């Protein structure tokens, strides 16, 4: 097993082929999820980029967190999308957590430990468990059809996924970094393979 | 009576049907009141929304705390309005306390523990005791005739009401959430009825 | 004598009839003085207003502390006037101390414990003891001829006066709320007469 | 959960009743750890005292940091003790960090950013996760059997725990106060209960 | 008031008659205080002496800061005592602050800007407001019964008293002589009476 | 000589006659100096003003610290000038230190304890000791020819002059007001002559 | 060797001739380096300037750290360049660390202890060992052809160089003034020739 | 060959089996050598220990750097011993360099960059090339017959060996750490075999 | 008169005949004085020696500064004596200032710029102005009867006398050698006569 503790994937150039693919142990479909990660990029002013691409064979945008230029975070489940407008962006490593509960469709979006207002999305939908989870690229087909103009350039790490909505107090722990253990996707117990020009480096963020 | 502590009502979509109705065990018509609440919504940039609607058969806007777009807090008692103009509104959870006394008609409006200047309103009025207290909607009938364009979207919680003007010292403790005991309307002992899509979730705020 | 400690005069409407007259014991002409007060008004958004009027039978602006629109504090003694041009004004209680010495005419203006540059005004003048001290109105005759366009709206309190120039240390103890003994006009021992709609309420400012 | 930054627990009298109990919801057993803390006491010449007591139900001294009078720091894991002799200790706040690695049993003790020599302890052992973590007292049973002659008298704070061995350059960051993310026990995000006479005060140490 | 700034009471010879009485405008009974002062004396290697003696009519040792031969500072409140043992003493001006809080009885003793360990004393007591404050002597009645063997011989100055516990940040400013405003007993505005052989000299200590 | 501690010269009106002349007990020509002073003036946005005018019969601008409108500080030695442009000036008391060394011509300028970049001026020059040092005016003869447009209005004090370049650590303590001994011009021991409307007052800055 | 600790090279004038040449007997060609330094200059808003110019006989820009006007830090290795655009330059002493690893070509750029995003440069290149390191000038031939329009004006110090990439924790140690051991270029152990008008002065920066 | 940069060998237990054997590519008999190393041990006050054991087939103490209890560093070549008395020894890592020259027998012994007095040992002797270099043990045969009472308990690292006398200037760089290239035994490029309980850890010294 | 600046009298040999006698332009009997001088001698562990001897026809010990072996500085006025005990003397040049005031009897004694505690002596006495000042001998008659066992051996210089008590500030400048103007006895303007073996030499102290 690989323990990524204090290590981040570095995607130091724009390309369509540098990416890492993550394997979840998940088999049953998701009635809820929380995903959290650190990322650090310069792109935000220049262009949009894919942060986190979760594609099932039914749907290439089954979970997508997308920075949209001059807009903010696009959050999409099942191809349906909502925006958390971010009007001023700062060159610092940013930590996000995003939780989606099917039963109500409530999306919480958390940036550096601050919550966004709970929006509604895709109430009653079910996320498929058979997924190609890709970091560094946007996939428009199951595990493929990357576009360089949507690649992440820079750092991504601490990528953790839960099959349930974390409470606010939990998320405070994640941000400050107290003890936690994910069950869908564990940074400390990460099954992954790396394709293209991708490096593991010490994380820049504490 | 439910201890709603740590929990908030989530109004995740614009609708004309999602509201919670709060039941006051209130006998005497109000010579004075204090209402305090947290809310968190992004609409402030976008449109007006009803924070707190208190209606009676003779008067639908018997108390209205209303965000008016690009203006700030409308405060109404008995159909008469005053404004606490807010030139710029943070996308953060806002705690407001508002207190009105019939003998003087002084309104104190408090935002996040900071007092606005006292303003006169409706000296010698007397607020009807038998009232429809609606969260999430503005109301024009006794308990209905809502408007989608004025529904709150996002969170409302810690809704406490006193039949008297708290001194500044109490209002400090409320903003701290220190030891206090409402008597008209107690979040720790809320009697309420929920209609439409309204969800009770962990509050996003201290 | 009334101990006004912790209490403020509230002028919640503009009128030319609401004023509180302060009775000084002073019988000997002032060759120097200091006047400190807390006030709270949003009128700065709107118009000029009298903070503090001190009229003698001869001269109605014997001491005037006046907010001049787009300018700031207009300090005039014996009808002659100086500006402390204030670049930016905010919705906060403001504590001012202003002291004048005949022997040199040095005016010191202190705002929230920050000194303005010393200016000379009316060197060699002498201020008459037989005066009418009015809060809430600018005063153009010994007890009257008020203008609504110049009234105070909101809060005035801690109105203390000395017949000598306080030192910088002494002023710091006023602002930080230490012990002091005003010998002309004592908030803790105020002889005063409310007229019209003026209220005594707890000071909003700590 | 409370942010304890800048604050310390004060245990101002010898007793067996005053303690604070820290919650670490660890799931996986600790194969390695680092614990760092600030403490301030004058007992060091009078008697021994428990700095940091970690107890499992099988083992009450599962991690103990103990000052042995006229000896120095006692570091025990799984009930076996090693001494870091300290021929004199001054009346000053002392920052200690101690790391233990199962894979080697190397114990690394740091006092005010100076390492002691590395020593071997409990090579191949494993520390149980379900534990009672106590400040101010020494445990002789899980969560209890405190003994006044072993209580801390004085201050303890900045209690941070990692489930891995910090490198020497990381420990300098802690000592110098650079940013860090404790993965087990986070002072910024501390979950605790207080029992008996214990107070939260501003830290005396920088 | 006298501005004592940079001036010290010199008690150059042993006597039982020479003392300074300090008048505090104090009427509320003190739930907490800070005493800070400079003193300079040879006696420390020879006999005990009163540093700072505060008496009420019911208690001659209401607050006492006493040097005890071969022991150190004795801090006593309401007649109950604790020792801050000073193992070895040198001939230099020493700046002390002492803080006491009723709500916990924590005594903070500060020597030249270094904190002693927090100790417990007289929790829940209250210090009487009507007091005789004497420098140079230890009083056993309200203002008398001095003893020559307990008199201070040497320099005392910068006697500042607060009715509240200064935070450590503050106290550093004190010891640096940063801007500070004592609200109970202020050097820069000292109301005092001298009896016998006490001289006002330039302070030796910077 | 006078100890001017905690006192400032006040130049409360614009004139050409009000100035104070400071006498340097100096006989040997200066190969280096440090001059530090506090001043407080509104003029900064209106017009230029002389801060510190040092003239000799050879050279009326032998040292000139001069505010040039919208430029900032002019520092001139021997009539040759360098600028420390200050793009925004604010109404606050400002402490400057300026240092000149002949052996290198390095000018250190310091504002409120922050150093400007070292610039070179007048390498190898030597400054005459027989000088008229005038505050409040720019002198264009040895001791006269003032210009009202160049007078200081406001306050100047703590003028301390050294015949050597203070190290940065020294200049730090000055700004803190640690103990220091200026050997050319000492505010604790100032010999001065006051001409016209100039007052000694308590200094407004801390 | 000379210990430059606490000392900076001052380049107080624009010149083509003022430089210091630093000697490293670097034997092995660099597959990695870190260079860290403090510099202080006002030119940032005026024009570009060379910070750190390292040349080999084959390549005049073998390592160059260059401020480029209204853009920021030009980092080039082997004549290939990347930009860390800086939109808004404080005039304050700035600490930078830059590291380059051949194996990846990852450039880390750190400004006042905060990392820029990692960028790719010259993957697989090797930096020549026989090199001339110039402070104060940009060199276009192995040891000359300096352009005064590119000279640094201001301070350079703490110039430490490692032949390997420092971890983030090592860089926090450098910036916080912790203990470090440079294996290529050592301010504590610096061997250099001053040429032209360069002075050694105490550093203006902590 | 391994780069042991920033790593140390750790001997955390007293044993006669834990050692590392260093394989010098030494082709020729040594007329001169320098050996420099960092080591860190408590034993110095307890008992003697081998630092650096060089044995040829002919001579088991061909070079031995030995801490003999209460004396200090025993330096012996060819079985002939000189003592550098170290009367006070401390718990700090100690960097030693030691050089011996056949042509003169002058031994330079350097402790933390301080030279001991030069001493004569074994003039004209010639050290054999066929040598077992052992760290952690003192060998009485070629590669064997260790004694647990002479083992190093603690850290050793930066083992660099030159077949020539380093000048003092070189030694300085060694101690501070600038660029150097050893030709007999290179820590940057080390061939070593590990026997028993020996660990490689991050070095504790900077 | 001779400017003796930078020069000291050297008394290289014990004798009862070597002295320098200093002539005071002093006529009014001293109500107060300060004397400051540098001396350097190794006798302090051998025997007592006269530092400074002031005689009148009526009183040979009118002012005596005397080192009394194992005690310290004997200071006597009118034959009344106080000791400033020195715990351990050091072999270095020492600067003392000692000052006396009749009106209070207070003695200030300064050693190397550090004040001793003020001690009372001879209050209300007056020192005779018709005086013989001798350096190098203790005089038991008006200008004679010296004792070799009391002679100074070594150096004395910078002997300055004021008819008044210098402030602490002033004494600092002395010790630093800032500009100062003695009015009783001026080393820059010295009248002296020399008998026996005394030499003028460059001063050893800085
Ligand atoms: Ca897609
Ligand atoms: Ca795409
Ligand atoms: Ca309505
Ligand atoms: Ca409506
Ligand atoms: Ca008028
Ligand atoms: Ca009017
Ligand atoms: Ca136990
Ligand atoms: Ca026990
Ligand atoms: Ca007593
Ligand atoms: Ca007594
Ligand atoms: Ca001019
Ligand atoms: Ca001029
Ligand atoms: Ca070039
Ligand atoms: Ca060039
Ligand atoms: Ca052997
Ligand atoms: Ca052996
Ligand atoms: Ca005698
Ligand atoms: Ca004699």
Numbering used by the authors:
A (entry chain J), B (entry chain I), C (entry chain H), D (entry chain A), E (entry chain B), F (entry chain G), ...: 1 to 206
Reproduce, without paraphrasing, sentences from the article in which this PDB structure was first reported:
C-reactive protein (CRP) is a pentameric protein of 115 kDa composed of five identical non-covalently associated pentraxin domains. The B-face binds to a range of ligands, with the canonical example being phosphocholine (PCh) head groups in lipids such as phosphatidylcholine. This is a calcium-dependent interaction, with each CRP monomer chelating two adjacent Ca2+ ions.
Intermolecular contacts between monomers within CRP decamers were also dominated by non-covalent ionic bonds, which formed a second ionic zipper, perpendicular to that found in CRP pentamers. Ionic bonds included Asp163(chain A)–Arg188(J), Glu170(A)–Arg6(J), Arg188(E)–Asp163(F), Arg188(B)–Asp169(H) and Asn172(C)–Ser181(G). Asp169 and Arg6 were able to form additional salt bridges in decamers compared to those formed in pentamers, whilst still participating in monomer-monomer interactions. Although decamers appeared to adopt C2 symmetry, they were solved without symmetry applied and reached resolutions of 3.3 – 2.8 Å. Intermonomeric ionic bonds found in decameric CRP at both pH 7.5 and pH 5 were similar to the crystal structures and the cryoEM-derived pentameric CRP at pH 7.5, except for at Glu197-Lys123 where there was a larger distribution of bond lengths, indicating conformational flexibility at this location. The proportions of these varied between conditions, with pH 5 containing more decamers than at pH 7.5, 68% vs 44% decamers, respectively. No crystallization is required for cryoEM using single-particle analysis, hence these decamers represent solution-phase structures of CRP, previously posited based on analytical ultracentrifugation (AUC). Residues implicated in C1 binding and/or complement activation are predominantly located on the A-face, and therefore binding of C1q to CRP will be sterically hindered by decamerization, which could inhibit complement activation by CRP at low pH.
